[model samples]
Target: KSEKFAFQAEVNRMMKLIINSLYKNKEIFLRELISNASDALDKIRLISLTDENALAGNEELTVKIKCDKEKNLLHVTDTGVGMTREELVKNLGTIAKSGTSEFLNKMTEAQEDGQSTSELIGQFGVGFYSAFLVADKVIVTSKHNNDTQHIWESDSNEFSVIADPRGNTLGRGTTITLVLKEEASDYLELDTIKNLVKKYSQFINFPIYVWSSKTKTVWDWELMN
Candidate 1:
């Protein structure tokens, strides 16, 4: 069975402000998404150690990046623990009841010696919304062990969750596609995407790969020896 949740009015406003005002660094969108991918990978890895079949459907626990310069489409795919249809709606459509106020309060109180506050964003589970900063539309395709494959689509204002027509291309994982904004075209470049991944997710436990045209290969720089 599938279900959908609408955003609270305040959450709709806050998300708009977050997408349009709060975030000045568009590049951080990539970082946030990859950080999420890392967490998914971690979950799957932990499960696999005990279940063996934790990755029964998807064997490759890696993150893959695909850039379509022509369409200004950038996709980050991971063969890791994926969300069910309910998860996609609940997690993406609504903000926490306490909202960013509590999140900011926690960060403010924790700001000792001026450490970067980016980590706090992940803690509140708000990093996923950062995708709206650079994309006019975001699509999430995911498959879970017990659930059928589903597609979650949103334009920041509203979102829809439906069964995927293409089925489980991931076997078991999530594929997040960002339909980049006109001004956010820089994200479609290989070098920019690579540098962003290395800077923010270099040491993440799972492997990260980027498609490269010059080398005609998927650069496994995250696993470089």
Candidate 2:
């Protein structure tokens, strides 16, 4: 059975703000997403410090990017601490909730540092919602140390979470896939993605790879024939 919820009026307003007006530049969606990935990676690394098994046997820590031009999709992946089922409901479902005024005032743990804070500055890590800026639909696959892989998806207003149909592709981390909106087609360009990743996240403390398509010369006897 599937669960359902409606916001009546509040989540509608919040999502409209996020989708229609939160960002001046849509390209930064990549930066925001990558930053969130870095945070996840850091959390897992920190956990492994105290508990050796904290990684849950998934050790290599890195972030990766790839594009699916034929499918008009883009993917950003990380080998970091994924979320539990409750976390999926709490962190992401927060954005989908109507009773979020208090949540809006609460600070994400990261914001407690001397760093600045803003509703747009990755609060509760709801920054993940920014993906909607450039994508019509977004799907997230995650696997936490103590939980099975799960899938979270949304078109914009509502999201659904279910056990991943593909099972556990990610031992520990998350993969976000975006079905690009027409205006955001540049996200699939290798140079566009590389430049944006460099501009905002070049100095981030993690390895980020942007999959690039390069042309190489090859001899083919069939073509010669």
Candidate 3:
């Protein structure tokens, strides 16, 4: 079963602000997504530090970017800490519910003793909405270690959450699929994706891969970082 949620007035306003004026460079969408993925991966790794079995099924931690030229879809997948159904609703359905921002607050308080918190992004919790800058629809499939797989989808107006019919395809993590707008087709090009990843996330802690074609008929995930 699927449940629908209308965007709150604040969330709707934030989404317009992001898609229209906040991020002038549309290419930043990939950067924001990759950064968010890296953050998720970081969380899972930290959890594993205290809980040895935290990463039972998926021991590898990395991010993957793949595009379907014919379908005009770009996917950013991360083998990171996936979100539960409640997290999906709270994090994506509202503003200021970001784990990143919450973590930032802790980091800030700790900084009273002199620590750094410069690397955190999405502090305003609007990074995910930036996907609307180039995509008409965005679908996220996530599988958390403690919960079953679920799907969250939106077109920037409203969103829906449902159990994924395909089961746990991700093992553990999340995959964001962007249905690119006609004018944003350049994001599907392997070279363009590579350049954007290199330009923005070359130093990201996790390995990033892009589905690339070595030849006309041979396609494989090429390491971007």
Model 3, stretches more than 4 Å misplaced? 96-125
lDDT of 2 at 88: 73
lDDT of 2 by residue, 166-213 (tens): 778888899999999998898888677777777767656777877665
Candidate No. with top TM-score: 3
Candidate 1, superposed: residue stretches over 4 Å from native: 1-5, 13-17, 20-22, 95-117, 215-225
lDDT scores for all predictions? 0.77, 0.72, 0.82
* Residues 108-201, model 3: lDDT tens digits: 4644555433333345334677899899999999999999999999988789999999998899999999999999999999889889988767
Report how far residue 180 has shifted in candidate 3, in Å.
Answer: 0.6
TM-score of each: 0.83, 0.80, 0.87
Model 1 vs truth, CA RMSD: 3.8
**lDDT of candidate 3?**
0.82
Each candidate structure's count of clashing pairs: 0, 0, 0
Ranking of predictions according to TM-score = 3, 1, 2
Q: Can you give the lDDT of residue 162 in candidate 1? A: 90
Error in Å for residue 72 of model 2? 0.8
lDDT of 2: 0.72
Candidate 2 global TM-score: 0.80
